[PDB]
Amino acid sequence: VDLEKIPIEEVFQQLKCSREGLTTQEGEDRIQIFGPNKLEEKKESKLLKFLGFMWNPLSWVMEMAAIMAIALANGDGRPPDWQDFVGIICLLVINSTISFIEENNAGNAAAALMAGLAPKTKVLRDGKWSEQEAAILVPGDIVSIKLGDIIPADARLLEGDPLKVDQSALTGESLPVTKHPGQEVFSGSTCKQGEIEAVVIATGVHTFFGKAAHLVDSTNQVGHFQKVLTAIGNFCICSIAIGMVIEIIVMYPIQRRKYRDGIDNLLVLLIGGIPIAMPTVLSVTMAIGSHRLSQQGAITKRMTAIEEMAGMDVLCSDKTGTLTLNKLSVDKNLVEVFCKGVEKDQVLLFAAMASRVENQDAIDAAMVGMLADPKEARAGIREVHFLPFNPVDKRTALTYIDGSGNWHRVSKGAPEQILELAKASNDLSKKVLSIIDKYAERGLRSLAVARQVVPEKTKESPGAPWEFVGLLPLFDPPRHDSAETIRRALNLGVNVKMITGDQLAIGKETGRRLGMGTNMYPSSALLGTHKDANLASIPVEELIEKADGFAGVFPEHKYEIVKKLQERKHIVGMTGDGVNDAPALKKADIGIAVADATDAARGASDIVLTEPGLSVIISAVLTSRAIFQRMKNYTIYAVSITIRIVFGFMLIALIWEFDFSAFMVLIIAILNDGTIMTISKDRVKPSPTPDSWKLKEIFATGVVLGGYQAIMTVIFFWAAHKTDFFSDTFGVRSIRDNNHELMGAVYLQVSIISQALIFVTRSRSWSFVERPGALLMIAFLIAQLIATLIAVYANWEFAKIRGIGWGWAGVIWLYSIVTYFPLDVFKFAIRYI
Template sequence: MYPIQDRDYRPGIDNLLVLLIGGIPIAMPTVLSVTMAIGSHRLSQQGAITKRMTAIEEMAGMDVLCSDKTGTLTLNKLTVDKNLIEVFAKGVDPDTVVLMAARASRVENQDAIDTAIVGMLADPKEARAGVQELHFLPFNPTDKRTALTYLDRDGKMHRVSKGAPEQILNLAHNKSDIERRVHAVIDKFAERGLRSLAVAYQEVPEGRKESAGGPWQFVGLMPLFDPPRHDSAETIRRALDLGVNVKMITGDQLAIGKETGRRLGMGTNMYPSSALLGQDKDESIVALPIDELIEKADGFAGVFPEHKYEIVKRLQARKHICGMTGDGVNDAPALKKADIGIAVADATDAARSASDIVLTEPGLSVIISAVLTSRAIFQRMKNYTIYAVSITIRIVLGFMLLALIWKFDFPPFMVLIIAILNDGTIMTISKDRVKPSPLPDSWKLAEIFTTGVVLGSYLAIMTVIFFWAAYKTDFFPRVFGVSTLEKTANDDFRKLASAIYLQVSIISQALIFVTRSRSWSFVERPGLLLVVAFVIAQLIATLIAVYANWSFAAIEGIGWGWAGVIWLYNLVFYFPLDIIKFMIRYALSGKAWDLLIEQRIAFTRQKDFGKEQRELQWAHAQRTLHGLQPPDTKMFTERTHFTELNQMAEEAKRRAEIARLRELHTLKGHVESVVRLKGLDIDTIQQAYTV
């Protein structure tokens, strides 16, 4: 354009510098890095150490959390009720069962089960009193049991083992005789939320610790109670309110998982791990694909580490941002696979190495607090990104129009001053006061760039209009009585450059208050540091515009009168920024936008987050599941089609809700659940209160 305008190349180089300095968001990497670093430090203070900075962004977008039960949802402080111990061997009493279980426990470096068992003895030393330990088999996720081989006072060799009932039952020589009774006791314990621990015993007549030994004798079953954490129910409710679906992934029995889920209010729609392989499916879910089953389930019981990996893999295939908690060596693959691997407190080194976040405090509340903090951090980064895009557009477009229309070349040095003051102020956004998103958040690029381009274009037009009014008209001198800045001899732009500098500096920095807020910018209170930095930066900018007579920068002071006019001009044109922001958000929420990009974006701005579409899909799936022919949508107009399907969706939901209430949440069901929990006799109560 400069050759066409018959202008010297030197102003063109100056303008090129202006566009490079003002158009490139040089501070973006620094601002984003500082924001994440400060946020990471805040997370560590809350008990969540981030090993990878980008995990903060992924935590903000997490919509599914697969949580272990023991130690996370519960206290992992086990207690045993000796009165409920079931004995299966002749000549054995509950005290003997406890002693055998204690001998099959570690006396040092104990886990929660060992601590509970040994703690039942009058003296912990009784666990090894009168015996000589020969070999101890520690617990591992595959065998799911421990065993001790020892010599008694008479020199005879024995072996005791405790562990998962199914594993111990498989050892018993009389499995077929006692299997039904064992499962009945396990179910009775599970209905009351009690885990079962089996104990077995065998003699080793060969006298060698490596030998297989004689037949195993199933000695008894011990009930273990692991109470839920006092804050787990409230934490799960908070998670659901935040759009995070918590799924219980436990190695315990299905009945225990359901009872724990009922107590914590996280649902009882749980399945055994065999359902992941397409086995043991109820009639209600037999037609569901595995991926959809995992997505809709509230949890899975009896899982092994490989099941955790499969759950994460399939959830990710359904486009979920998945978090997974773990503590053991075998959890490492699932933690590595998850978008956010979370090593709980007291996790092994292998689990911590594979995770993205390491918790220093137990419980689920730490994770939910980290989610809120991560969303606040992400919100700050998104606010700044919209601001940076807007400023880039306003600098490039605004000064380009001034150069092309009026041959006005803004001094590069003054653009450098604007950049320094703006970037220094924006650094404080890392500690800004923000409202975290109520739902999982992500980089909505269409929204960010559309908002940035529109706001930046508006600011550029503001500058062009101001330049025109000050340079080509007498509006400001006539209305406000200030000196004229109209075109002078030899095109002296020094005072006009100062005026443009102040106008651009003020409104550019004020834009951050618009981009940081979801509602009106003057309603959401910003952080004190941001306000102080803005005031100081613009005070400096105003003093420069009023007093600076810098020949090297080609500016001249304009006085306090013009400074007041520019502040008033910016204030008047600041208020439409919020309205424009709302209009952009409204435009992006419509159906036309989704059709324009063929629904290929990774987010939705549909009304109620696409609730209507999800209901239609759900109704279609329910009709197909029950063998009903879906309606021929070609026979309907679009309006009729949506109306009919909406009605079917509502009817299907009502039927499902009635069935669910009838099956799970009737008054009788609640009463029976409480009665089982308290160990009362339901028949006695019914006779006493029958009218």
């Protein structure tokens, strides 16, 4: 092996890389353009095989419709079916052209979104500590790896303390493995612990994970959005089958109708009934919504999270990450010291000493500045090693050489862990815990400092038993708008529940000034069923739903808390930040990574914020509902147009044996298809309650609207055929059996009402009251001007249509206008129940 398991070690970098650390950018480019990149491109992009050509189920039925015209014409026996057949292909060509250009445009607008969620690596280039995308990474170079980084390539650790990497999933072993200088690590691994520099070996394609991958197979096959999209497709296809395959076929021999030339009634049901617009419009609506979220501040790593975000019912929010600022502050009056000889004004300095000073943890950054002059924190101390924060240790420490060569060490950490650095007298333990609990009653978190000296003047030897120097009170404080945001979320029907590892007194005290209510519990009490605490009086699951927040949350508890809420049917949003939030984020309905979350948390989460605070999440939830509203309204529209077309033309054929022009319906479909890319760009107001995309309600809303429109179409036909009524009042013309003129009028009436239905379906109140905006009006007016012009002037024997004057068309416009107003009353009536 060139490297791998065998340790070529220090020789290997010198033999190949031939340089150390600061490797110039020009050197990377030559090997980058040679061929190394993180991973291979997906198969079948060549020749625009599926990027210029569609093949959804609806297109398959449309292909049958085109063939059916040829099939039922005996090939060249009947000429107009071929004219329809080329027309059907032209509609498919037009639909495909608009479909694929808009998705391409949406994909171009999501490049920044894809860029935001890309794997990113941290490097020092020209001596400049920098962060770069992982596709820029060069095999054989030196990189910097921090806790919770995703390892981007094979790498050999360079120097520095052992750290723990998690090989689970890649190798399927739960326990993370300690990795030492010189040892190899692999792409896709996540650091559970520690921090080290390393030399990357080979790109992910050369990594064993890339070697293992042979033949590509279905990935996320069961994705819910596609299944509901198919179900909307299934219902409209069923309606055509109910309309055509049964009843129209049923009426042919019961009444002994014409056969060969009756098939046009089947073709109109196919050509107008099938909404090939419907999958494209919904597909691009989410894509533009994600770009809106990218503007908003939320990067939808999962594109389908809009449905879950719209349906979200409860949001479990980390107090430290989302509810509170995290520029912690200490009033030194309440700092209490021990091991006197140290003093209240000086124990802050030790905390500043044990804080990193350049790239800073939020608490580290505060304490560097808390002594007023940041130079004082580092002034002449001559540090020799720094021990960085680790979640199992909860501790930092600085080792330094001072005076005549004394080796001293100072440390910060969580006080319970600091109290075990030298297990103190229980008198001391009771005293420190009393002030810690007093700070918690005050509402302030506690950090403890400690000090030791090492007599053996060496990095690797334990020093003298630690002094428990003291511990200091740190304020959260709340963000300005989180206090509003809980109220806003409550109004929008999402219950915000606090999550924190802080003891309950901190959470309630912060929570009361936040405004969240204090009916909240230690998670450990409610974890499982074995901890009692009056479980019989209130089930833990029932109590958890009632609870307004959870304190002392460990990561096992956090997964359980969402799981219990998710089992209680609630759609659970949950924020996360760290390496051990990943399973809770994965199992949550919406995993939300906070802006400063670890990349492991960003990978595990469905959605990744790039802007901090609970306020951002509620704005994203509110915006997501506004995007979600128009998917339902188009689905109501798409079903409703399908029902009116399917019912209308067959029903006149059933009653008055009237064959409608297939080409005219084809014209309606193209005009509809040309105008429905307004719908994605509408400005519907969000639903206030969460909503879960109940298909039955939207189908019920659409079918009643379409049935009413079909009924008014049938009334229009009867008015201008069997009876004299239409020309009795202001008959500029008069027609009954003038079928080519008559169906031109039917075309014009159907087209206007079909376009107007967009205004009904988008609006929740009166269609007039909710303003349309210019694009929808222009799409309506241009389409209906063209529809009017065809109705007035088209003398086409091929299309069975004869031009019927503007005065008559004006009556059709007037009839459509007075038909339109009770659509809202029908819309209100169906969605009342």
